[PDB]
Design an enzyme around this catalytic site. Structure first.
Site, PDB file in Angstrom:
ATOM      1  CG  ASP A  47      -2.220   0.813   1.051  1.00  0.00           C
ATOM      2  OD1 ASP A  47      -2.394   1.387  -0.006  1.00  0.00           O
ATOM      3  OD2 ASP A  47      -2.758   1.263   2.244  1.00  0.00           O
ATOM      4  NE  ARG A 103      -4.080   6.083  -0.588  1.00  0.00           N
ATOM      5  CZ  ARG A 103      -3.600   5.543  -1.677  1.00  0.00           C
ATOM      6  NH1 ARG A 103      -2.993   6.203  -2.522  1.00  0.00           N
ATOM      7  NH2 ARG A 103      -4.155   4.266  -1.761  1.00  0.00           N
TER       8      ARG A 103
END
Length: 269
Positions: free
Chosen positions: A134, A138
């Site tokens: 992931d 962000r």
């Protein structure tokens, strides 16, 4: 053990929430103080339900790490309500929002510094036989000295080693950041995290542009398998874009390792 190590339990009387600094999937995120008196980030659970086992599992993974460029875990609160994960506080928050806020205010050389830290954190992760799955801007956090730290361990998985592969049965994944073989064949490796690192490099050199712009996930996927790669960002040194392209080799074995990435980035600095 699942996961009570190295998860130091904290008593609620030590924690002081002062303001909301964000909303996770799990609940609000606060800035506060911790006493044993230091500033911390405090992640809460919401009528949450098994959404709790996942919540505390992230901390269990995080607590096994000790590295400059990996978010430090201070501890958890699992006995009282609401449940809380306490980490080091990062002043400048998420990396993509921060670069958008401060576009054109960093030199190329400072941006490469930020990437070297991320790469250093990922190298450590891979030596602990983790794949993150992931890696995105962000999910990198930035402290007040512009030090970047990897942060979001929900999707992480232990590996193993010629082909140390995690094959997923499925789940939500960040499509624009994921290696083609991991989307199409569900095979995740530290090389697929290297693909993701390339996209992060691009996000950094564009000061927070969304990868692939307004293309839909479906168009991105056809493009990527038609040999489309993201273009050089404005004012990006050829050597850095050449590194991006190496991270985006269609074949995972032609991609550099995180150890190689750190050397290449150090050199350019």
């Amino acid at each position: 053990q699942a996961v009570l190590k190295f998860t130091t339990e904290i008593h609620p009387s030590c924690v002081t929430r002062q303001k909301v600094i964000g909303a996770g999937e799990f609940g609000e995120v606060y800035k506060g103080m911790l006493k044993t008196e230091v500033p911390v980030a405090i992640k809460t659970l919401k009528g949450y339900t098994k959404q709790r086992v996942d919540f505390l599992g992230e901390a269990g993974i995080m607590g096994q790490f000790s590295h400059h460029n990996i978010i430090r875990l201070e501890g958890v609160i699992s006995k009282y309500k609401p449940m809380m994960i306490i980490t080091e506080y990062m002043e400048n928050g998420a990396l993509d929002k921060f670069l958008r806020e401060k576009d054109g205010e960093f030199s190329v050389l400072q941006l490469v510094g930020m990437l070297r830290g991320i790469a250093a954190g990922m190298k450590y992760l891979a030596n602990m036989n983790y794949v993150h799955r992931d890696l995105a801007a962000r999910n990198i956090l930035v402290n007040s000295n512009l030090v970047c730290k990897v942060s979001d361990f929900g999707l992480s998985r232990v590996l193993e080693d010629p082909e140390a592969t995690y094959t997923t049965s499925g789940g939500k994944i960040p499509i624009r950041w994921t290696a083609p073989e991991a989307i199409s064949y569900r095979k995740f490796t530290s090389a697929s995290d290297v693909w993701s690192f390339g996209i992060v490099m691009w996000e950094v050199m564009t000061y927070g542009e969304r990868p692939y712009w307004e293309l839909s996930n479906h168009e991105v996927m056809k493009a990527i398998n038609d040999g489309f790669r993201l273009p050089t960002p404005m004012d990006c040194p050829s050597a850095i874009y050449q590194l991006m392209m190496q991270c985006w080799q269609q074949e995972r074995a032609r991609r550099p390792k995180f150890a190689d990435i750190v050397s290449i980035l150090d050199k350019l600095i």
